[PDB]
């Protein structure tokens, strides 16, 4: 899984069959660690206009 | 025998986690209110089932009587078979092309001809008590979806979660099950006696390709879901994604009677060439 | 086309097959297509569920019949040559219109959007042209337009008329419809239920509105002040203070009935206008579609911005839909014509939502023509057009 | 067709007539009243001498004219539909 | 009705979706506006004889 | 062979909705000239001009 975002710690409960998370609109919301298990949240970098 | 199935047979589709949302997707599942096939796990063992897209296997029972799966283009050692066999301490999946009897043996562990095994895999049992399974065979993997549940078909909504994948990449046309019995005689064939066993029932659904809306829970877990294709009002619900409709007119869908016949039509004959002036001649 | 009259009520359906004759498919034929599952009546009803060519359906209450529509009752008033008909009483009601004005501002980033910052994508999307800046171009415009919107409507009155701390106007009670000096946001009642009933990136982003909630709250309440102050006067000119039972008949004269009438039924009157500004907030609650035009453009407006976004997973015939995987698994050359369909695909999503807001944001300009309009005319004056 | 349809209306055409029917019956025997509430009928004479007021001509004028003012607004409805029908 | 370009249409998104939600809008909108129209009158009155 | 077709139908069947909307919006104002003149003309007398 590819993507780029700032990672924080996760309030989510995963079931244990689950790999990927996501919100409405196909949007990946969150993605537990290949190495420790632990729910990871991701949100994309700050951007904008100016 | 036969038995309606009722809202059961759904399972997690593809290990992606989801929370208070419905989801569409189209799968082959098993049709909500389709009938299937009812089987005894007494005796005669059970004839070949062919393996069309994938089965929805239930089981009530209560003393192992059946154990294991075979599956494969033939029973025969011309092609490789694959072989599922659980037992009290570990399961055994194998790939090896093993030569099986007229009939399946009645557990005494193993009869077969020789094995040139490809792939072989072993890890912890698959074990009133309603037993449902779903085997599925699409993309060069055969794939199991497994769940264990309290309690004939309950009308209880219970979805069914991805126990294996494996990657053997056998073409499975057909498919058998494996009995065991306490203190039973074992011989490469036998009559339809059969040996004494616990009373216990095997039902059997085909799957077929379906659009169901799937519902999640604040918990990420599937609680309810729609046949898309059962009834007018079940499609209603999902072309406005909504369980509850209100007061209206809804445009669902379209119909168009489909052709009866094919027909071709050339030019009334079929006008020749010489060749009976080529073939015939008097003399060359 | 399925005729549900609500899961809430029941499951039972009626289908209708529209383009058909049931010759060739209870039973029933209609012009419209041949309906099944309902049965026919004689009797008309106000119909509800409208199927078409004068024929409705509806619950029955446990059976769904259809039915002609009717038109009313029929009233035959007695005309004669020599015969005329007056009232003797009359009581005055209050009638709640609304109307839209104005719509989400939104500004979307092209680049972004169609490949999210990708070297090998840009560098390709540069060749397309300046699609870009004219989409840009054309949701600026929009987003100005909605905020002057606003302003056309409701920036009418240049001074903040303050209402006076002795609140009696002669037996009237303003209450319902004046601000609420304990609540902080300082809304009316009414103004609090409205608020209340009606409830609701990839380089897509929402743009806040010019004037606050407050300060248009503000603006309403500096019109109501002078309207009740004032009359007609400060919408010409001056503000000049009058009593408000003078004002109001004033008001009656101008629909044709001597003002007498209105200083010997003065007590009358303010309980009839009473009773009906507290009826009105009772009949805003209970309706459940009554607020049906403010709720619709935000969802409209939702639901084009969801479809956009989900549109990026779309495939459109390339071998992937995530950019990395196309530029990983394949070479260059094969990746360019991978490549450009993603980019053409997403670039036509764009382009319609573009076309449809500008199609929406014209109806809401008519809209909020008429609402200014409704403003000068109804508010700060009098109007003999009739309804 | 190839996928198209033409979906009826839902309003017949004699459900319409009907409905215009009773406007112009209602302005026949009841004037502007009908459309502020309850419809009061009141003589068409009267009613037109209303009218007269309303555009600031005294309603003598109409009763001393009535047969004139009559005879000329059924020459005029009577070369409506000629007109129209002759008209491309 | 071909098989083999449903299977290719059903990836290019939900186009055809948006496509029928317009033009149901503008077949009520019709039916809106005769009714706006002509259907002012509450009562039906009816034509002394 | 067939993407070709495909896109092709599907933008001239976007043309003709798009071509649709702008009619559609044009007749409502039409429209609601007419029920503004069946109000005022019809049940009532009008002072103004033309
Ligand atoms: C299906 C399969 O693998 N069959 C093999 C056969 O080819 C081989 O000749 C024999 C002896 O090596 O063992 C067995
Ligand atoms: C990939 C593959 O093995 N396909 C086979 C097919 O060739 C055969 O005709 C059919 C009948 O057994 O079974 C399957
Ligand atoms: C709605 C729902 O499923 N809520 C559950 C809650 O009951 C439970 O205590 C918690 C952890 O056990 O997970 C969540
Ligand atoms: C018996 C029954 O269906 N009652 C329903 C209730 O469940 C629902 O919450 C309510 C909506 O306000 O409408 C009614
Ligand atoms: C209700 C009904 O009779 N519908 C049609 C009728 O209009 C038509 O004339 C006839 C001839 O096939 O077929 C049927
Ligand atoms: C189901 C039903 O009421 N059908 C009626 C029928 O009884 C009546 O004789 C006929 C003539 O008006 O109209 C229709
Ligand atoms: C005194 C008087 O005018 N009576 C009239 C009569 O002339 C007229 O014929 C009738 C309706 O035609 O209504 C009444
Ligand atoms: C005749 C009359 O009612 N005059 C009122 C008086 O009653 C009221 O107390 C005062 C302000 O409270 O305004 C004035
Ligand atoms: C001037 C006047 O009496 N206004 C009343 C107020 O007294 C009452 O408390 C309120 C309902 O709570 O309705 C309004």
């Known amino acids: ?50 | ?284 | 086309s399925v005729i549900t009259p609500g899961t809430n009520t029941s499951n039972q359906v009626a289908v209708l097959y529209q383009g058909v004759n049931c010759t060739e498919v209870n039973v029933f034929q209609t012009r419209a297509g041949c309906l099944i599952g309902a049965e026919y009546v004689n009797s008309s009803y106000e119909c509800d569920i409208p199927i078409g060519a004068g024929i409705c359906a509806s619950y029955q209450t446990q059976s769904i019949i259809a039915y002609t529509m009717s038109l009313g009752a029929e009233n035959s008033v007695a005309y004669s040559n020599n015969s005329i008909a007056i009232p003797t009483n009359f009581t005055i009601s209050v009638t709640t219109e609304i109307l839209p004005v104005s719509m989400t501002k939104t500004s979307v980033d092209c680049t972004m959007y169609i490949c999210g910052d990708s070297t090998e994508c840009s560098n390709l999307l540069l060749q397309y042209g300046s699609f870009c800046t004219q989409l840009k171009r054309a949701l600026t415009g929009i987003a100005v337009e909605q905020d002057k919107n606003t302003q056309e409507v409701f920036a009418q009155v240049k001074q903040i008329y303050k209402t006076p701390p002795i609140k009696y106007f002669g037996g009237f009670n303003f209450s319902q419809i004046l601000p609420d000096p304990s609540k902080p946001s300082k809304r009316s009642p009414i103004e609090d239920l409205l608020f209340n009933k009606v409830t609701l990136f990839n380089g897509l982003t929402v743009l806040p509105p010019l004037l606050t909630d407050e300060m248009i709250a503000q603006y309403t309440s500096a019109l109501l002040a002078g309207t009740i102050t004032s009359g007609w006067t400060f919408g010409a000119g001056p503000a000049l203070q009058i009593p408000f039972p003078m004002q109001m008949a004033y008001r009656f004269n101008g629909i044709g009935v001597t003002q007498n009438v209105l200083y010997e039924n003065q007590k009358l009157i303010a309980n009839q206008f009473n009773s009906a500004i507290g009826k009105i907030q009772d009949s805003l609650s209970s309706t459940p579609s009554a607020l049906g035009k403010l709720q619709d453009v935000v969802n409209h407006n939702a639901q084009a911005l969801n479809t956009l976004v989900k549109q990026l997973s779309s495939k459109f015939g390339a071998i992937s839909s995530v950019l990395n995987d196309i530029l990983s698994r394949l070479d260059p050359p094969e990746a360019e014509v991978q490549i450009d369909r993603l980019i053409t695909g997403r670039l036509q999503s764009l382009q319609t939502y573009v076309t449809q807001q500008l199609i929406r944001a014209a109806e809401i300009r008519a809209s909020a023509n008429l609402a200014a309009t409704k403003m000068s005319e109804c508010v700060l004056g009098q109007s003999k057009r009739v309804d």
């Open chain 2, 1 to 284: 025998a036969y038995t309606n199935s009722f809202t059961r047979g759904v399972y997690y589709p593809d290990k992606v986690f989801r929370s208070s949302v419905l989801h569409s997707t189209q799968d082959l599942f098993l049709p909500f209110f389709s009938n299937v096939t009812w089987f005894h796990a007494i005796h005669v063992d059970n004839p070949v089932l062919p393996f069309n897209d994938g089965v929805y296997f239930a089981s009530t029972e209560k003393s192992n009587i059946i154990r294991g799966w075979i599956f494969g283009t033939t029973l025969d050692s011309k092609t490789q078979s694959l072989l599922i066999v659980n037992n009290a301490t570990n399961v055994v999946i194998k790939v090896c092309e093993f030569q099986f009897c007229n009939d399946p043996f009645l557990d005494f562990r193993v009869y077969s001809s020789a094995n040139n095994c490809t792939f072989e895999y072993v890890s912890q049992p698959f074990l009133k008590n309603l037993r449902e399974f779903v085997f599925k065979n699409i993309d060069g993997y055969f794939k199991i979806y497994s769940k264990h549940t309290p309690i004939d078909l309950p009308q209880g909504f219970s979805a069914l979660e991805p126990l294996v994948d494996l990657p053997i990449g056998i073409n499975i046309t057909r498919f058998q099950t494996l009995l065991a019995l306490h203190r039973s005689y074992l011989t490469p064939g036998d009559s339809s006696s059969g040996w004494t066993a616990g009373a216990a029932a095997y039902y059997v659904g085909y799957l077929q390709p379906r659009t169901f809306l799937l519902k999640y829970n604040e918990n990420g877990t599937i609680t309810d879901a729609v046949d898309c294709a059962l009834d007018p009002l079940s499609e209603t619900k999902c072309t406005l994604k909504s369980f509850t409709v209100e007061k209206g007119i809804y445009q669902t869908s379209n119909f168009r009677v489909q052709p009866t016949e094919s027909i071709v039509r050339f030019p009334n004959i079929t006008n020749l060439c010489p060749f009976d002036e080529v073939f015939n001649a008097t003399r060359f």
């Open chain 1, 1 to 50: 899984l590819t993507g780029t975002g700032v990672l924080t710690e996760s309030n989510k409960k995963f079931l244990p069959f689950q790999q990927f998370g996501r919100d409405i609109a196909d949007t990946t919301d969150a993605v537990r660690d290949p190495q420790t298990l632990e729910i990871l949240d991701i949100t994309p970098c700050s951007f904008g206009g100016v």
